[PDB]
């Protein structure tokens, strides 16, 4: 049967966190048609590693930046490579997924995306999307505890997918997010999360500022050297988790958020992510932003949005932010824990984006051929400026004030007018990748 | 200890199977400098899947086709993406590999390439390359039986690497091929080879022509549908082998070469591979050659070269051709066992290569931006024409005579002037991939 949940219809004036100009007339009709087409026709995964379908991210991010119909059609066409036929649904499997032991058994298999999508659309039709998200992520059932680790997989793509669904209150996009979460292949991060949380809750680990834990990752050779450059998309599974899981779990346990610390922890994790992006530069080289660090920033807006949900308990919001900052240490390790310095972003002189304000940068981004990452990082940074309003740089907050926009300018300047493979550096700590980057 | 084996130096006038025009003066000096740089500086593997370094293949194929110094420099620059720093050697690991248990225990790990390379350069320094190849591939030890399955891994890359070292009698390149063979990640093909051979030698399985075995693979839904499109580089491991290993082993067991049948089996396996490339076209679509089928043809020249080695028993040459023809069914299944028809190559009208002969096509290939696959497929097809001279098309030989050059023209026409990702179709049996191909 046709589910009401399957129809993705955005209506009303809500146009995204970090929005400035409203999209001109016609854009919402185009967004609705393309979002529905993508929902119905395309899989979540188009290849076995780094294969996340970004179509919904690119569309909603371009809409939030005030893009027109033509800018949404551009976003959609730029992500043609991400768009492959959705897998056939087995309705027998969908019925069996209501059994939580079968639900757990079938997780972490990419080919199950469409089965979990039909399952979550059916559950959301019956119970409403808020009730289903609480049940399957926050209820502390065996299934929800697995799902919560899965939510951070693949450099935060399930958190992003679910985040957009929550942000726009789109029940069928919430279903995509939960199905993405269930089906994502495992990087062996669940035991890292369990180990670090068990140490953090023991009473025996003193909390430390996140910026000091990045330094501990770089300064601990066994963690720093765990990932290998040519492990590429499996640096986390085969390197950081395979060689140094216990070691990095002991570092991550020191990131602890007190019951009044939610807003400050979102600012701290977002600031340290931005610091990684801006600060991992090399003398004599043009500015480049690390692909993985960019994901630490693009995902950060969804922590701010989750933090504002009235159907979610403060203790769950705090747990999300703790796990996110802990996994940011893992992605930092996976880029070979590059030296960070605040001077790079402080001293950066914008090129293509010089003299622009946010409105002008937003408009430049809406037309730039891209898979959605430029629109996502620029929006997360505009939003970070709002979240962190009145917070200045300090020993624990490495980026703030003018730094949020300066990083958005750097991201634009270092990616615009390049083919997608030249845009982002695929691990800033690996000396060899800088031999392929332009000298000043 | 500097080894004599680590020096790669081609001298004399041997310029490769299928060679026509001699390279002009300066080419040999350029080849020797680039071959040595690649041998010394670069790993065999630049990413975890489909990450084979083709530099040696591209240089030696362009040289065989009569390329100039500038054609060799282009081939080398075009394979810059394949060229990443060689892994550090652990000399204590190299000493331990003398123990057959430790040798076997460390196999199938990409990161051990440089450790196996040093090991094989040391063994070849002591015993000569022929004795080391017999010991580690053909001696029937536990290690050699494992190595022999590994030789066909990753669509025949270890076989190609070793084949060029044997072809040019380059001890250091033979070392490259054995080390590639040892280190290559496993696709669970070793048990396929074991199950198919056991059935073939049981006396319970009547032999059948290879063309009927391609047909049986397509006509058996369990085998044809085992691989999924979005499994990409792991279709064999996670699809054909994961779902249908026993089923396809039973089909492959029917390919059986009699004691005088070596030359006919090389022609039959090469003709069926060429038929896959030429024959898997679609109505209303421009011609495109399947990437994996192309490997089934590029590797074929090395079966012919191995067949002419006086140090290798006839039984071992026959065993190579049986295993290769059997794994060709697995690669056909991995591309979703497309319908083949002899009309496409018979009716094909050359476009860019219209009116060229072999010498003009060779010259056109030497200058074409490419990673080495075009040079390799055109050389294999010129050689196939010599191997199969006087053999006409039949019920069991689907491609012959003018078909070899016609397919070479099709490969040039369908790849020239395109960026690398657009050159070859990544699984001709998947209908969806043809929606991205140009209409006639
Ligand atoms: Fe992404
Ligand atoms: Fe290849």
What are the strands, taking DSSP E only, across A42-180?
none
CA gap B267, A399 in Å, rounded: 67
Which runs of consecutive H residues, i.e. helices, occur in B109-261? Answer: 113-127, 129-133, 142-150, 153-167, 171-183, 190-202, 210-219, 221-224, 241-252
**How far apart are the CA of B298 and the centre of ligand 2, in A?**
8
Please tell me the distance from the alpha carbon of residue B378 to that of residue B67, in angstroms, as a whole number. 14
Of B84, B85, B234, the CB nearest to A48: B234
For chain B, the domains span 20-82, 91-183, 206-434
- Return d(Cα A351, Cα A379) in angstroms, integer: 20
Tokens, residue B418? 């395109």
Interatomic CA distance for residues B327 and A251, integer angstroms: 48
Provide the 3-class DSSP secondary structure of residue A55. helix
User: What does the alpha-carbon distance between residue A386 and residue A396 come to, in Å, rounded to a whole number?
Assistant: 19
* List of residues 6+ apart from B222 with CB closer than 8 A: B243, B244, B247
Q: Which ligand is nearest to the CA of A156?
A: 1
CA B2 distance to own-chain centroid = 31
Secondary structure of residue B52 in the 3-state scheme: strand
Nearest-angstrom CA–CA distance, A231 and B82: 14
Tell me if residue A439 falls in helix, strand or coil. strand
Distance CA A235, CA A225 (A): 11
The DSSP H or E segment spanning B383 is helix B373-387
Burial class (CB in 10 A: 0-12, 13-18, 19+), B301: buried
Number of alpha carbons in the 13 Å side-chain half-sphere of residue B311: 14
In this structure, which ligand is nearest to the CA of A154? Answer: 1
Whether A45 and B230 lie within 8 Å, measured CB to CB: yes
Distance from CA of B55 to the nearest CA of A (A): 17
Distance from the Cα of A109 to chain B's closest Cα (Å) equals: 11
CA distance A175 to chain B (A): 21
Count Cβ atoms below 10 Å from residue A206 Cβ, excluding itself: 8
The whole-angstrom distance between B87's CA and the closest CA on chain A is 10
How far B12 CA sits from the closest chain A CA (Å)? 37
Contacts of A233 in chain B (CB under 8 A): 48
For residue B154, the ligand closest to its alpha carbon is: 2
DSSP annotation of A51 reads -
CA–centroid distance, B157 to ligand 2, in Å, is: 6
- Tell me how many helices (H) and strands (E) chain A has: 25, 0
Place of tokens 């350069």: B121
- What does the alpha-carbon distance between residue A108 and residue A176 come to, in Å, rounded to a whole number? 15
* Rg over CA atoms, chain B: 20
Nearest CA of chain B to the CA of A48: how many Å?
Answer: 6
Q: At CB < 8 Å, which residues of chain B contact A?
A: 43, 45-49, 51, 84-85, 110-111, 228-234, 238, 432
Buried b (16+ CB within 10 A) or exposed e, B262-275: bebbbbbbbbbbbb
Q: How far apart are CA A314 and CA B216, in angstroms?
A: 61
CA separation for the pair A376, B27 (Å, rounded): 50
Nearest to A280 by CA among A209, A331, A353: A331
Contacts of A238 in chain B (CB under 8 A): 48
CA angle A433, A434, A440 (to 5 degrees): 155
8 Å CB contact of B49 and A49 = yes
CA–CA dist B339, B341 (Å, integer)? 7
For residues B65 and B16, what is the distance between their CA atoms, to the nearest angstrom?
8
Nearest to A121 by CA among A267, A208, A1: A1
> How far apart are alpha carbons A11 and A17 in whole angstroms?
16
**Whether A228 and B111 lie within 8 Å, measured CB to CB:** yes
Q: In Å, what is the CA distance from A402 to each residue of A164, A396, B195?
A: 27, 17, 66
Q: Are B223 and B337 in contact (CB under 8 A)?
A: yes
Is-contact B38 B16, C-beta < 8 A? Answer: no
Of B26, B278, B299, B24, the C-alpha closest to B166 is: B299
Q: Where are the beta strands (DSSP E) in A104-144?
A: none
Nearest to A383 by CA among A262, A299, A297, A301: A301
- Residue A220 alpha carbon to ligand 2 centre in Å: 39
How far is B190 from B144, CA to CA, in rounded Å?
12
CA of A377 to the centre of ligand 1 (A): 10
Q: Residue A31 and residue A50: Cα distance in Å, rounded?
A: 25
Contact A56, A176 (CB under 8 A): yes
- Choose the mutation target among A185, A230, A422, A437 for the interface with B, i.e. most B CBs under 10 Å: A230
Contact, B19 vs B61, CB < 8 A?
Answer: no
Instruction: Point out the residue among A46, A230, A432 whose CB comes nearest to the CB of B47.
Output: A230
Exposed e or buried b per residue across A350-363, where buried means at least 16 C-beta atoms within 10 angstroms of its C-beta: beebeebebeebbb
- Ligand 2 centroid vs B155 CA: distance in angstroms? 7
Cα–Cα separations (whole angstroms), residue A104 to A143, A162, B368: 6, 19, 51
**Contact residues, chain A, for B235 at CB < 8 Å:** none
Collapsed DSSP state (helix, strand, coil) of residue A437: coil
Residues forming a β-bridge with B290: B425
B230/A84 touch (CB, cutoff 8 Å), yes or no: yes
Say which of A43, A232, A233 has its CB closest to residue B230. Answer: A43
Q: How far is the CA of A15 from the centre of ligand 1 (A)?
A: 21
Instruction: List the one residue out of A230, A239, A334 whose CA is nearest residue A290.
Output: A334
Give me ligand 2 centre to Cα B292, in Å.
Answer: 8
Kindly report the three-state secondary structure assignment for every residue of chain B: CCCHHHCCCCCCCCCCCCCCCCCCCCHHHHHHHHHHHHHHHECCECCCCCCECCHHHHHHHHHHCCCCHHHHHHHHHHCHHHCCECCCCCHHHHHHCCCHHHHHHCCCCHHHHHHHHHHHHHHHHHHCHHHHHHHHHHCCCHHHHHHHHHCCHHHHHHHHHHHHHHHCCCHHHHHHHHHHHHHCCCCCCHHHHHHHHHHHHHCCCCCCCHHHHHHHHHHCHHHHCCCCHHHHHHHHHHHHHHHHHHHHHHHHCCCCCCCCCHHHHHHHHHHHHHHHHHHCCCCCECCCCEHHHHHHHHCHHHHHHHHCCCCCCHHHHHHHHHHHHHHHHHHHHHCCCCCCCCHHHHHCCCCCCCCCCHHHHHHHHHHCCCCCHHHHHHHHHHHHHHHCCCCCCCCCCCCCCCHHHHHHHHHHHHHCCCCHHHCCECCCCCHHHHCCCCEC
Matching residue, tokens 């289903």: A132
Query: B233 vs A48: CB contact, 8 Å cut-off?
Result: yes
Nearest to A432 among B51, B85, B234 (CB): B85
- A95 to chain B, closest Cα gap in Å: 23
- Smallest CA–CA distance from A230 into chain B, residue: B47
What counts of helices (H) and strands (E) characterise chain B?
Answer: 23, 0
- Placement of tokens 């080695």 in the chain: B309
Task: Check if the beta carbon of residue B167 is closer than 8 Å to that of residue B305.
Answer: yes
Using alpha carbons, select from B383, B410, B384 the residue that is nearest to residue B397.
Answer: B384
Please give the method by which this entry was determined.
X-ray
> Do the beta carbons of residue B319 and residue B361 sit within 8 Å?
no
Q: Which ligand is nearest to the CA of A370?
A: 1
Cβ-nearest to A85 among B45, B231, B432? B432
Distance (Å) from CA B160 to ligand 2 centroid: 9
Structure tokens belonging to residue B213: 């075995």
Query: What's the DSSP call for residue A136?
Result: I
B227 to chain A: which residues are within 8 Å by CB?
none
Q: Which two three-digit tokens encode residue A301?
A: 């807006």
Which residues, 6+ apart, have CB-to-CB distance to B214 below 8 Å? B272, B275, B276, B329, B332, B337, B340
A104-143 b/e (C-beta count within 10 Å ≥ 16 → b): bebbbbbbbbbbbbbbbbbbbbeeebbebbbbbbbeeeeb
What's the gap between Cα A179 and its chain centre?
A: 16
Rg (CA), chain A: 20
Tell me how far apart the alpha carbons of residues A187 and A195 are, in angstroms, rounded to a whole number: 15
Query: Of B59, B68, B19, which is closest to residue B39 (Cα–Cα)?
Result: B59
| Widest distance between CA atoms in chain A | 61
E strands present in A21-153: none
DSSP annotation of A42 reads B
Tokens of B189: 């093909």
Burial of A339: CB neighbours in 10 Å, binned 0-12, 13-18, 19+ = exposed
Q: How many residues does chain B have?
A: 440
Ligand with minimal distance to A57 CA: 1
Distance from CA of A333 to the nearest CA of B (A): 18
Largest Cα separation within chain B, whole Å, is 61
Q: Which of A137, A338, A130 is nearest to A218 (CA)?
A: A338
| Residue in the block written with tokens 């004795």 | B131
């Amino acid at each position: 049967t046709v589910l009401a949940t399957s129809r993705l219809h955005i209506e009303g004036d809500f146009r995204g966190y970090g929005s400035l100009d409203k999209s001109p007339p016609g854009a919402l009709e185009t967004l609705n048609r393309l979002m529905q087409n993508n929902h119905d026709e395309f899989d979540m995964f188009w290849r076995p590693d780094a294969g996340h379908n970004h179509t919904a991210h690119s569309l909603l991010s371009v809409y939030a930046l005030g893009g027109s119909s033509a800018d949404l059609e551009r976003a959609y066409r730029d992500d043609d490579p991400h768009q492959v036929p959705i897998g056939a649904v087995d309705h027998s499997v969908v019925a069996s997924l209501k059994d939580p032991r079968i639900f757990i058994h079938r997780m972490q298999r990419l080919d199950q995306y469409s089965n979990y999508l039909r399952f979550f659309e059916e559950r959301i039709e019956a119970r409403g999307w808020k009730a289903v998200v609480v049940e399957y992520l926050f209820s502390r059932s065996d299934a929800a505890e697995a799902m919560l680790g899965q939510l951070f997989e693949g450099a935060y793509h399930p958190l992003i997918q679910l985040g957009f669904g929550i942000e726009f209150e789109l029940p069928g996009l919430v279903a995509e997010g939960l199905a993405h979460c269930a089906a994502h292949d495992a990087a062996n991060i669940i035991p890292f999360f369990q180990k670090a949380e068990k140490l953090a809750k023991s009473g025996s680990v003193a909390p430390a500022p996140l910026v000091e834990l990045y330094k501990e990752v770089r300064d601990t050779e066994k963690i720093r050297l765990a990932a290998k450059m040519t492990q590429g998309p499996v640096r986390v599974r085969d390197g950081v988790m395979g060689e140094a899981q216990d070691d990095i779990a002991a570092v991550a346990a020191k990131f602890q958020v007190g019951p009044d610390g939610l807003k400050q922890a979102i600012i701290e994790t977002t600031s340290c992510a931005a610091y990684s992006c801006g600060g991992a530069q090399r003398p004599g080289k043009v500015a480049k932003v690390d692909f993985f660090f960019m994901h630490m920033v693009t995902s950060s807006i969804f922590l701010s949005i989750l933090a504002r949900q009235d159907w979610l308990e403060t203790e769950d919001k705090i747990r999300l932010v703790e796990w996110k900052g802990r996994l940011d240490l893992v992605w930092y390790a996976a880029s070979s824990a590059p030296a960070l310095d605040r001077k790079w972003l402080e001293q950066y002189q914008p090129t293509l984006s010089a003299g622009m304000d946010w409105r002008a940068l937003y408009r430049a981004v809406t037309v730039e051929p891209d898979d959605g990452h430029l629109a996502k990082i620029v929006r997360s940074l505009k939003w970070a400026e709002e979240e962190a309003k009145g917070v200045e740089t300090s020993e624990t907050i490495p980026v703030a004030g003018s730094g949020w926009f300066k990083l958005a300018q750097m991201a634009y300047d270092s990616t615009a007018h390049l083919p997608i493979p030249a845009k982002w550096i695929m691990g800033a700590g690996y000396d060899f990748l800088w031999t392929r980057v332009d000298s000043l």
